[PDB]
Amino acid sequence: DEDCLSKDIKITYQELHNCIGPKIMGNTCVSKNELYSDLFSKNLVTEYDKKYFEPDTVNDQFNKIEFAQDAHRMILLERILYKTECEMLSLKKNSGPYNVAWRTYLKNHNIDLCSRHNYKMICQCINTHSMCKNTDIDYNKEIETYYKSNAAAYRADLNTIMDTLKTAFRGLTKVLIENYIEKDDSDALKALFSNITDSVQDNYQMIGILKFASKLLDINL
Numbered sequence: 001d002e003d004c005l006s007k008d009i010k011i012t013y014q015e016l017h018n019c020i021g022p023k024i025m026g027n028t029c030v031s032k033n034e035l036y037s038d039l040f041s042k043n044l045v046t047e048y049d050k051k052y053f054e055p056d057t058v059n060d061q062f063n064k065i066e067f068a069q070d071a072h073r074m075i076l077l078e079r080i081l082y083k084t085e086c087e088m089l090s091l092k093k094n095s096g097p098y099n100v101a102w103r104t105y106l107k108n109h110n111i112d113l114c115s116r117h118n119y120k121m122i123c124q125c126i127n128t129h130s131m132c133k134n135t136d137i138d139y140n141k142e143i144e145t146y147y148k149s150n151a152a153a154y155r156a157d158l159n160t161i162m163d164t165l166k167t168a169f170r171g172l173t174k175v176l177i178e179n180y181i182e183k184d185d186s187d188a189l190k191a192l193f194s195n196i197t198d199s200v201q202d203n204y205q206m207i208g209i210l211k212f213a214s215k216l217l218d219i220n221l
């Protein structure tokens, strides 16, 4: 698994799936100077990169990634953010202010499916933080029946879920999501959601949200 900083200038959006925060992040948040010495000693950054390791707020790092016009720059800034910003580590778990952020944003303006069908697993996952393991399983295809009869609620709920995911995974993940959403690339979106799933297996509710998101993409209208 070659390092995202090792590879070439021409990078596909598909290869960038290896470089997203959830995947490169571990269980630690080192200082930026320690990450710089670490990557430098691996011949992955140079002194010309040192400016990218200076302190900055997390929102400004988000914007520097999400407006980046160079792929190597986007990869490096994502790596720095998710290796050095301690709050991001909460994404591998259930609790933390960063999880309550997207969690309350999602429950707040809920999805229309849950108004008339509060008993569906996705609705229990969103509202009561429970039953998140089975959110993609549609027993007797009741969820799919609902959406193809209420396309307004389908587009509203799909947009709400996409916005939830883009809020939870600022940076490269959000760039990729917006890219595929504009290209109408549902296969790529399901592949990205699958890749994220592999990296956040201990984020119960977020696993539920990703499963449900992939299910919604199967519902093709």
Ligand SMILES: *[C@@H]1O[C@H](CO)[C@@H](O[C@@H]2O[C@H](CO)[C@@H](O)[C@H](O)[C@H]2NC(C)=O)[C@H](O)[C@H]1NC(C)=O
Pocket (backbone or CB within 6 Å): 014, 017, 018, 187, 190, 191, 192, 194, 195
């Ligand atoms: C992320 O997930 C995607 C899809 O699950 C992976 O891409 C697939 O890899 C298999 C490996 O045999 C291929 O047969 C498929 O053609 C690939 N694409 C799809 C759409 O299934 C990918 O390997 C995962 N990891 C990344 C991108 O780092």
Ligand SMILES: [Cl-]
Pocket (backbone or CB within 6 Å): 130, 131, 132, 133, 134
């Ligand atoms: Cl469960």
Ligand SMILES: [Cl-]
Pocket (backbone or CB within 6 Å): 201, 202, 203, 204, 205
């Ligand atoms: Cl879990």
